[PDB]
Each structure stands twice: as structure tokens, then as C-alpha cells.
Ligand binder design. Structure first.
Ligand SMILES: *[C@@H](O)[C@H](C[C@@H]1CCNC1=O)NC(=O)[C@H](CC(C)C)NC(=O)c1cc2ccccc2[nH]1
Ligand SMILES: *[C@@H](O)[C@H](C[C@@H]1CCNC1=O)NC(=O)[C@H](CC(C)C)NC(=O)c1cc2ccccc2[nH]1
Lengths: 215, 214
């Protein structure tokens, strides 16, 4: 497989967004992975509505700003037969009534694939598919304060993840890393991204709950 | 400047409101611009009271449901030393007695700036300041009935503006202003309209733009 991948250079990834004061990480993770797969299919990069997911995906098991799962979000888009653009259904960092309108649907999906709980499998998927939704353990001060280099936190869990993010690539320092897009704004980390330790015992659980939508 | 800006995703903009059967557009535009500048200053997004402006800004020149201007509303907030929250001083779509109460003030301003009367200066303000109050010519059936794409009306005028609204951003699909209206969420695109940008100061969008200084 390639030793390095960065889907950002290839047009698959929208700018970093900001969840604000709302536990909607899972919705940002899901929209990032679907943005990637819709670009793969159509050649158009269009920002998708996390608000739509937050407001409408309760039946599939999601709890809005109180948490949720990317796979539940992918199931919603399939069940719903669409997902609105960001520009039509803007993010408000709270839960509102479902206002889905098919008029402004710009994405869809046909299911999802859960990747085997192996960093090797995740690497293959990143190389072959595009950006991939992943859960990490993000609940450490070292992660708030991350600015540069490869992130490693000896107290990270490989089993107890709490944060949904998007792997957009991987590589190495000229000491391997995953390239991860967060949803804490561009001021956090390296332009909103973090290089997380790769092939270091599934560090922070990055390969434990990885998935992507089919389109 | 960036080629695209949308302050809604950055926490500067409240949900779309509905003026109902009252010519209070100017008050919704003003509260929008002040909600954005108060967010810029404090990091808190709090919906402000249009009714407080409708009821109380007569001395600064406004005429309640019979019309008004955003700058007169910004002058009121300055003169008054405050503006009540929406939740404290709810909207009734009619003019009442002034019930302003400082206990519930959650906004202030120190003044206000008028933007140079060019779309280039408007673009610079939107990119650097936040949501901007603007006046447009909305009195065309096309606008009345917009749903998607970029709005362009040949019979639109650049000096006969009659409607106050809020520019929250701009971009391209062929450029547009992203404009928050106050006709509820069922109108337009969730309550918004993409208005032609850099096409003959279309509908007079850069003719009377301003924002409060906080
Ligand atoms: C990230 O914004 C979010 C933060 C938590 C929400 C409430 N407090 C938090 O710290 N994390 C999540 O939403 C995680 C993401 C996964 C991928 C690890 N999922 C959940 O917390 C969660 C809650 C919940 C309740 C019912 C069903 C599923 C479910 N998932
Ligand atoms: C939008 O709600 C409002 C609609 C008019 C008022 C009643 N009839 C209408 O159609 N439009 C306004 O309030 C406009 C907005 C500006 C920014 C163009 N302003 C006026 O009509 C206006 C300003 C003003 C100042 C003093 C006295 C009267 C007066 N009217």
C-alpha cells in the first residue's frame, strides 16, 4: 500500500468545522465520511448538514447533542433517502425539530461498512476508499493542548472511545501517524487536525470502531 | 478576502424569525447585526428583542410596524444604554407601550458604522466584521416567491430599497450574498436567499449597509 495518503490534496475533504458547545462529534464524523464518498462518486465536494443529523436521527439511536454514532447517522441517511446541504440546513449547536427538506438533499447512502478492528485493515480502507469515520479516546489534556508532531498519550484507551473524528490519510515523519480531522475549529491543533500515532497498539482506539458509508 | 464566508456555522446567527403582519423588517435586521456583534465580543449568542425596538425607538425616528431603519435602532440601543433579550420582551407583531427594563438588558452598543456604498466594501465588512444589516428592494413577485439558486430580478432597483435584512455571508455556486430574511423558515431556503453579488449593486444591497460597534 502507499506509505503516505492525504485525501485533502485530492479534493475529498471540506474545511474544518466547529461543533461548538454540543456533543455532535459523531455527526461531523459522519458528514465528513459522506462528503468524501459523494465526491468519489460525483466529483463535487459539497458540505453536508450536521444539523439534519442532530435533529432527525433519533429513531436510528442518536441522541443529538448528548451523543451518537456515525453508523446510526449513515443508517438515517439511507432510511431518509437523503441529507440536506450545510448551506440549506445550517449548524446551530443545539437540537431542533426535524426540518429535513428533500428539495435541498445533496447526498444519499446505501448502507455502511464496519472495518475490522485492525490498524492494517483501517490503512487498507483509507488507501482504497477515502476518508473513514473513527472513534477515539480524546478525553485527555494532552489532546486539548495538541499543537504539532505525532500525538501519543500513555493513558489513552484502545477500548473506551468517546469522540468521533475522520481519518483523511496517514504517513510518517522524515514514526507513523494517522491524519485526523477534528471538529473543534481550525484554531485547535494543526489547522484543526491531529497526527495520531499509527501502528502503536491501536493507540486511542482508532481502529476499534471505524466505518464508512456506501453510496 | 475569502471567496466564501458563512457566519452561521461559526455561531454568530440566531434561527430565522418571523415578523408576521408588521413592517418590522428593520428591527429584525438590527437585532441580527447586534446578535452577531455581541457574539463577537462575548462568545454568547442571545436572541434580542425586536419588540423592544418597535415599542421604544420612536425618538430615534422609527415608526414601529409602519417602518424604520437599522441605524435608528442602533442609535436607540446606544441612547438607551441597553436592549432586552427576546425571551424577556417577546415579539407581538404590533406596537405596544415601551416596557424596556434594564434588568433584562443583554446587549449594548457604542455607536455604529455605515459601510461605503460599494459591493467591494460590503464584502470586506462581511469578511472582517460579521453579519451586516442591509436594505434591499424586495418588492418584486420573484423575491416574494424565491426558493433556490441565485436571485436576480431585472426590475430590481438600487435606490428604492424597502426591506431590511441581514447579510450573513457570501459565496459562489456566479456569486451571491447569503441573506437572512424575517419571513419565517418556510420562505426561501430555510428563511434565507442567495442574492446576486457583483451584478449592478443588485436590489441596492450595498446602498445602505451598517453594523453596530459594541
Ligand atoms: C463527541 O462530541 C461526543 C461527546 C459525548 C456526548 C455527550 N458527552 C460526551 O462527552 N461523543 C459521542 O457522541 C460518542 C462518539 C462515539 C463514536 C464514540 N458517542 C456517544 O457518546 C454516544 C452516546 C449514546 C447514547 C445512546 C446511543 C449511542 C450513543 N453514543
Ligand atoms: C419591512 O418590514 C419594512 C416594510 C415597510 C414598512 C411598512 N410598509 C412597508 O412595506 N420596511 C422598512 O421598514 C424600510 C426598511 C429600510 C431599511 C429600507 N424602511 C421604511 O419603510 C422606513 C424608514 C423610515 C424612517 C422614518 C419614517 C418612516 C420610515 N419608513
Amino acid at each position: 500500500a502507499p506509505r503516505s495518503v492525504d485525501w485533502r490534496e485530492k479534493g475529498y475533504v471540506t474545511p474544518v468545522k466547529n461543533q461548538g458547545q454540543c456533543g455532535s462529534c459523531w455527526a461531523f464524523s459522519a458528514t465528513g465520511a459522506l462528503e468524501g464518498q459523494m465526491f468519489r462518486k460525483t466529483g463535487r465536494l459539497i458540505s453536508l448538514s450536521e444539523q439534519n443529523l442532530v435533529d432527525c436521527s433519533g429513531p436510528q439511536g442518536n441522541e443529538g447533542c448528548n451523543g451518537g454514532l456515525m453508523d446510526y447517522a449513515f443508517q438515517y441517511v439511507q432510511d431518509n433517502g437523503g441529507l440536506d446541504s450545510e448551506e440549506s440546513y445550517p449548524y446551530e449547536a443545539t437540537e431542533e425539530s426535524c426540518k429535513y427538506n428533500p428539495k435541498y438533499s445533496v447526498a444519499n447512502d446505501t448502507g455502511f461498512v464496519d472495518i475490522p478492528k485492525q490498524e492494517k485493515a483501517l490503512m487498507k480502507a483509507v488507501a482504497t476508499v477515502g476518508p473513514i469515520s473513527v472513534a477515539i479516546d480524546a478525553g485527555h489534556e494532552s489532546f486539548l493542548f495538541y499543537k504539532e508532531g505525532i500525538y501519543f498519550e500513555p493513558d489513552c484507551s484502545s477500548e473506551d472511545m468517546d469522540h468521533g473524528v475522520l481519518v483523511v490519510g496517514y504517513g510518517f515523519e522524515s514514526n507513523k501517524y494517522w491524519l485526523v480531522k477534528n471538529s473543534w475549529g481550525e484554531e485547535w491543533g494543526m489547522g484543526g487536525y491531529v497526527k495520531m500515532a499509527k501502528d502503536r497498539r491501536n493507540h486511542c482506539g482508532i481502529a476499534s470502531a471505524a466505518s464508512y458509508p456506501t453510496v
